[PDB]
């Protein structure tokens, strides 16, 4: 038998052996996230440790096949994934310490609380206490306190751990034939083997930086306008030419500027497309929200949700008698099991998020026929893009009116559509410089370009230069403000959110053209469009068997990401911004700081 | 004498790799219990009509029964090339009969995981039509011998379904009954 023949029957034995163990590990972790007890927290580890022990057993058993001797790329793809020595290439004491600091960082972040010095008996953690302050408070000193306390209390606790977290994770990547841990993360976009579609780990840095400069005209003009509106909310606090204080951006880090809409709305006189009270007047529950989302995907040619989905999903908080993890998630346990975990309230944000999570399941349902190692998105940014194009079509006023949430007499002027685009810009385009600057800092730290004596110094130098944001109080090298964000202290890559933001508009522009939509790209609804549904379904069923260069090309016709569809979405808003910023300074000074 | 179709209402069905066959000799057949019943998930016939079968005569009838996965029921048909058809239960291209299947998740799937129902994942050469293999010899996938021990390129040929009630419909246990109709030269199952 050929080495390829021996590897195919090995993967056949693995896929059937792995699918059963993965299901027990996934269902055990479901019973914990929906029923946090002591039996279920140990069953999650018992079923989780057995999966990891089985995976390492299959790691070395897969390494007995020389990767160059295999010609079938589908089996060659699965072998390289199994032969990844991963974090087990470290010695036991290094791997046990790495797993400890990864758990300790995830602990003091989720359980870290700061106490009000004015009211010491009222202490609050990030969610929902500190996040509510950064989202709604209009007091400069109150926002300054919550912003600094989170980075001085739990941020400093993460500083010595993150230093050991970098050196241990770097040794893991350099042992697996990578440059640094950043090079290890960029391997998710790497394509090697397909002629005409190859893609290197350095091509990611080149492609995101070349496309980021094409976004600067739109972000700088929004930054100038938001600065002008923020000056009216915090007078004598923001220089008309300087950067924005980090604690006045709408959340703990300024990742999204959505909460700045109350201060930056172009025409607050117009009626607010907030259908939260409208959903209540129709006596909606969480079932009604998800049953309506189910109706959406069926109208475009996709099937209903599985019978087990409506039986096993947790669409409401099971009360205070049984506490669960209320983070909205879409579960793909395998073996035909598809669930959604979401403590849905009767609001509009949970309505749109229900379409995002159900989009993930439609993606999970499509590639279910693929082998086990190929049941995933094309890259890390494909799932998030597929989920957003669902809420994009479900957020247009014509779609919201046709459902019954908005009155059928809503006049879609050039003022209500510019208020809508401004709200979309605060979220979609506001996070692009925040995401790149974060990953660029993490890329340099792993490459050693940013030494420990200027970890935080180079961090805030890039905040001023790249993002146009200045710290309200100076931070020395004791802080670890990047680790004060969830994805940084929990060992999650962040460039996935940059790529998914560009992907979702390439996807949206392609489907809306097939949906026979005529108006602006921001007014498109792909509902009732089976033409766009089958066009997208050709992508989700592909999974990871084909490279992302092909999967993206299969739907939009491009081997790489493109910033043009994103600029077309906000083009009517871009011209309105340039009209406002004629008597305002466009750009920021990297030397202004709210102190001396 | 009435034919003993009440194979269907048997308590335990065999695994697909070790399916069982019952010969149905001289008896009057009760086909009407089948075509007036939406109890099955498939009920697909080949070579003979579902209603014209009442007034027909065959030499004898053979009832093959086993249990297969939901997504594997499609392989119980003439001209299928799946894992079940090639390595567990093969139907001839000239098959004349009816395949029947009904969902049995509540009785064949437990929360702990019912692993009794097994199937053959590896086998040298496909099965002849209506052939059956029960050998549990360690399948040798490489070129070095397996000495009755498992390891690299030496896998156990039998794999078991992990039938559980929370699986999707495509992975729930379905009991299958493959009724085949034989015609040779001699006269025994009628209903004119
Ligand atoms: C690389 O290996 C994979 C896996 O062995 C190959 O995919 C397999 O290709 C065969 C055809 O050569 C498929 O067989 C077909 O199965 C369907 C089942 O419904 C049947 O109806 C057809 O009559 C045919 O027998 C097989 O399904 C398919 N496997 C998967 C998982 O899709 C692939 O072709 C190999 N690459 C190259 C270039 O040969
Ligand atoms: C294409 O998508 C649109 C977007 O929802 C669908 O429009 C809505 O369709 C429903 C039922 O298909 C309509 O409900 C009906 O409302 C009338 C109101 O007078 C009521 O009398 C009926 O008993 C029924 O409840 C809904 O009104 C309609 N939306 C609007 C704004 O008219 C449309 O059905 C889709 N096209 C298809 C599925 O072919
Ligand atoms: C919450 O988790 C527990 C186990 O951690 C679930 O099971 C209970 O387990 C105990 C211990 O054997 C039994 O005595 C109980 O009868 C089980 N059921 C209940 C309702 O207590 C429990 O079912 C989980 N809760 C829910 C709502 O699923
Ligand atoms: C994994 O590590 C082992 C030793 O730790 C080594 O022998 C093997 O070649 C490595 N495999 C890969 C694919 O790097
Ligand atoms: C989805 O389920 C509803 C339930 O009433 C049914 O009417 C509809 O036909 C189903 N559609 C599909 C595609 O399964
Ligand atoms: C099996 O029993 C049920 C009721 O117990 C009956 O309706 C059905 O006809 C029986 N099947 C056969 C083949 O006799
Ligand atoms: Cl920060
Ligand atoms: Zn998501």
CA distances from B112 to A20, A158, A168, B108 (A): 12, 41, 39, 12
Q: Say if the Cβ atoms of A336 and B169 lie within 8 Å.
A: yes
In the block, tokens 């009724």 appear at B179
* Alpha-carbon span A426 to A418, nearest angstrom: 12
- Angle, alpha carbons A502-A508-A510 (nearest 5°): 105
Environment class of A331 (CB within 10 Å of its CB; exposed 0-12, middle 13-18, buried 19+): buried
The one catalytic residue in A357, A439, A509, A546 is A357
Neighbouring-strand partners of residue A329: A341
Q: How far apart are CA A521 and CA A75, in angstroms?
A: 40
How far B172 CA sits from the closest chain A CA (Å)?
A: 9
Cα(A300)–Cα(A111) distance, integer angstroms: 43
Strand partners, B176: B66, B101
Q: Which residues contact A31 (CB under 8 A, 6 or more apart)?
A: A40, A43, A44
The enclosing H or E element of B35 equals: helix B32-35
Report d(CA A213, CA A204) in Å as an integer. Answer: 15
Q: Which residue has the tokens 């309200």?
A: A472
User: How far is Cα A174 from Cα A168, in angstroms, rounded to an integer?
Assistant: 10
Tell which atom from ligand 1 comes closest to the C-alpha of A369. 31
Domains and CATH numbers, chain B: 16-121+160-190 (3.30.70.1840)
Residue A311 distance to chain B (closest CA, Å): 9
d(CA B16, CA A185): 45
Asked if residue A128 has a cis previous peptide bond (ω within 30° of 0), the answer is: yes
Interchain pair A27, B153: CB under 8 A: no
CA-based end-to-end distance of chain B:
15
| Distance of CA A248 from the midpoint of ligand 7 (Å) | 12
The three-state DSSP-derived secondary structure of A542-591 is: CCCCCCHHHHHHHHCCCCCCCCHHHHHHCHHHHHHHHHHCCCCCCCCECC
Within 8 A by CB and 6+ apart from B54, the residues are B31, B32, B191
Query: Could you tell me the distance, in angstroms and rounded to a whole number, from the CA of residue B95 to the centre of ligand 2?
Result: 49
Q: How many CB atoms lie within 10 A of CB A426?
A: 22
Cβ of B112 less than 6 Å from ligand 1: no
Structure-token pair, residue A143: 């926002």
d(CA A369, CA A350): 30
Q: Which phi and psi (to 5°) does residue A66 adopt?
A: -65, 120
Sign of the Cα torsion A375, A379, A382, A383 reads positive
Q: Give me the helix-helix angle, A571-580 and A416-428, nearest 10°.
A: 90
The resolution, in angstroms to one decimal, equals: 3.1
Does the CB of B110 have a partner CB in chain A at under 8 Å?
no
How far A565 CA lies from chain B's nearest CA (Å)?
Answer: 38
Output the CA torsion A222→A224→A229→A233 (10° steps). Answer: 120
The question of whether A294 is a catalytic residue gets the answer no
User: Atom 4 of ligand 3 has which residue's CA nearest to it?
Assistant: A39
Measure the CA–CA gap between A481 and A257, rounded to whole angstroms.
Answer: 18
Long-range Cβ contact pairs of A188-196 (< 8 A, separation 24 or more): A188/A379, A188/A380, A188/A493, A188/A496, A189/A379, A189/A380, A189/A499, A189/A548, A191/A547, A191/A548, A191/A549, A193/A73, A193/A76, A194/A73, A194/A547, A194/A549, A194/A550, A196/A559
Domain extent at residue A45: 1-596
Residues in CB range of B184: below 8 A, 6 or more apart: B59
Distance CA B187, CA A21 (A): 53
Distance (Å, rounded) from C-alpha A130 to C-alpha A110? Answer: 12
For residue B46, the cross-strand partners are: B97
**Residue B99 parent element (H or E):** strand B97-103
The yes-or-no answer on residue A487 being catalytic is: yes
Q: Who surrounds ion ligand 7 at CB < 5 A?
A: A 253, 481
**Could you tell me which residues come within 8 angstroms of residue B97 by beta carbon, excluding any fewer than 6 positions away?**
B45, B46, B47, B48, B178, B179, B180, B181
Alpha-carbon distance A434 to A236, whole Å? 25
Q: Is the dihedral of CA A187, A188, A189, A193 positive or negative?
A: positive
Q: Which of B142, B162, B170 sits opposite A20 (nearest CB)?
A: B162
Instruction: Tell me the H-state helices in B97-137.
Output: 105-108
Q: Do B162 and A335 touch (CB under 8 A)?
A: yes
Residue of A nearest to B160 (CA): A16
Binary contact (A336, B122; C-beta < 8 A): no
Q: Do A6 and B141 touch (CB under 8 A)?
A: yes
Specify the 3-state DSSP secondary structure of B163: strand
Any known ligand binding at A356?
Answer: yes
- Best mutation target among B155, B166, B172 (most A Cβ atoms within 10 Å) is B166
**How close are the terminal C-alpha atoms of chain A, in Å?**
75
Q: What one-character-per-residue DSSP string does A63-117 give?
A: TTS-GGG---HHHHHHHHHHS--GGGGS-HHHHHHHHHHHHHHHHHHHS-EEE-S
Total domains, chain A:
1
State the distance from the centre of ligand 8 to the C-alpha of A360, rounded, in angstroms: 6
Q: Return d(Cα A230, Cα A207) in angstroms, integer.
A: 33
Distance B111 CA to ligand 3 centre (A): 14
- Report angle CA B151, B156, B159 to the nearest 5 degrees: 130
Residue A46 touches chain B, beta carbons under 8 Å: no
Please, are residues B105 and B165 in contact by the beta-carbon 8 Å criterion?
A: yes
SS3 B31: coil
- Contact call for residues A348 and A273 (beta carbons, < 8 A): no
Please provide the size of chain A in residues. 596
Is A384 flagged in the annotation as binding? yes
Method: X-ray
């Amino acid at each position: 038998s050929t080495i390829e023949e021996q590897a195919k029957t090995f993967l056949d034995k693995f896929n059937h052996e792995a699918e059963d163990l993965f299901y027990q590990s996934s269902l055990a972790s479901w019973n914990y996230n929906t029923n946090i007890t002591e039996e279920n927290v140990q069953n999650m580890n018992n079923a989780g440790d057995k999966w990891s022990a089985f995976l390492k057993e299959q790691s070395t058993l897969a390494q007995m096949y020389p990767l160059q001797e295999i010609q079938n790329l589908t089996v060659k793809l699965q072998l390289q994934a199994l032969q990844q020595n991963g974090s087990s290439v470290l010695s036991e004491d290094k791997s046990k310490r790495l797993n400890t600091i990864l758990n300790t960082m995830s602990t003091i972040y989720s359980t870290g609380k700061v106490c009000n010095p004015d009211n010491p008996q009222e202490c609050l953690l990030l969610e929902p206490g500190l996040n509510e302050i950064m989202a709604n408070s209009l007091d400069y000193n109150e926002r300054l306190w919550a912003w600094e306390s989170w980075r001085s209390e739990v941020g400093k606790q993460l500083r010595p751990l993150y230093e050991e977290y970098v050196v241990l994770k770097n040794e893991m990547a350099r042992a697996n034939h990578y440059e640094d841990y950043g090079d290890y993360w960029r391997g998710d976009y790497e394509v090697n083997g397909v002629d005409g579609y190859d893609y290197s780990r350095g091509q990611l840095i080149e492609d995101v930086e070349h496309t980021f400069e094409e976004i600067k005209p739109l972000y700088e003009h929004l930054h100038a306008y938001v600065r002008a509106k923020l000056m009216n909310a915090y007078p004598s606090y923001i220089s008309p030419i300087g950067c924005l204080p980090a604690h006045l951006l709408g959340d703990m880090w300024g990742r999204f500027w959505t909460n700045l809409y109350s201060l930056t709305v172009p025409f607050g006189q117009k009626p607010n497309i907030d259908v939260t009270d409208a959903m209540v007047d129709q006596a909606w529950d969480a079932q009604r929200i998800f049953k309506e989302a189910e109706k959406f995907f069926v109208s475009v040619g996709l099937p209903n949700m599985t019978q087990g989905f409506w039986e096993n999903s947790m669409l409401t908080d099971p009360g205070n008698v049984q506490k669960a993890v209320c983070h909205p998630t879409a579960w793909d346990l395998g073996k035909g099991d598809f669930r959604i975990l979401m403590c849905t309230k009767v609001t509009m944000d949970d309505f749109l998020t229900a379409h995002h999570e159900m989009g993930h399941i439609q993606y999970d349902m499509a590639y279910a026929a693929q082998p086990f190692l190929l049941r995933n998105g094309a890259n890390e940014g494909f799932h998030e893009a597929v989920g957003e194009i669902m809420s994009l079509s479900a957020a247009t006023p014509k779609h919201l009116k046709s459902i019954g949430l908005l009155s059928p007499d809503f006049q879609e002027d050039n003022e209500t559509e510019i208020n809508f685009l401004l709200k979309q810009a605060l979220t979609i385009v506001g996070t692009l410089p925040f995401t790149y600057m974060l990953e660029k800092w993490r890329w340099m730290v792993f490459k050693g370009e940013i030494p420990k004596d200027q970890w935080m110094k180079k961090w805030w130098e890039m905040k001023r230069e790249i993002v146009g944001v200045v710290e309200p109080v100076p931070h020395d090298e004791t802080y670890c403000d990047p680790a004060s964000l969830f994805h940084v202290s929990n060992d999650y890559s962040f460039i996935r959110y940059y790529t998914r933001t560009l992907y979702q508009f390439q996807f949206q522009e392609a489907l809306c053209q097939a949906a026979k939509h005529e108006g602006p790209l921001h007014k498109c609804d792909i509902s009732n469009s089976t033409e766009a549904g089958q066009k997208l379904f050709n992508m989700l069923r592909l999974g990871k068997s084909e490279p992302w260069t092909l999967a993206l090309e299969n739907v939009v016709g491009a081997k790489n990401m493109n910033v043009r569809p994103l600029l077309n979405y906000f083009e009517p808003l871009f011209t309105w911004l340039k009209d406002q910023n004629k008597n305002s300074f466009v750009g920021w000074s990297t030397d202004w700081s709210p102190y001396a | 004498n009435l034919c003993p179709f009440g194979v269907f209402n048997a308590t335990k069905f065999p695994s697909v790799y070790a399916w069982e066959r019952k010969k149905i000799s001289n008896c009057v057949a009760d086909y009407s219990v089948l075509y007036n019943s939406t109890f099955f998930s498939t009920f697909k016939c080949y070579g003979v009509s579902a209603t014209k079968l009442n007034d027909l005569c065959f030499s004898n009838v053979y009832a093959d029964s086993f249990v297969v996965k939901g997504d594997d029921v499609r392989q119980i048909a003439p001209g299928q090339t799946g894992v079940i058809a090639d390595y567990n239960y093969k139907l001839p291209d000239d098959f004349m009969g009816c395949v029947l299947a009904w969902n049995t998740r509540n009785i064949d799937a437990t929360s702990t995981g019912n692993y009794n129902y097994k199937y053959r994942l590896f086998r040298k050469s496909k099965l002849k039509p209506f052939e059956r293999d029960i050998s549990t010899e360690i399948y040798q996938a490489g070129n070095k011998p397996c000495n009755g021990v498992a390891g690299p390129n030496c896998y156990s040929p039998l794999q078991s379904y992990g039938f559980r009630p929370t699986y999707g419909v495509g992975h729930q246990p379905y009991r299958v009954v493959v009724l085949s109709f034989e015609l040779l030269n001699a006269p025994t199952v009628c209903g004119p």
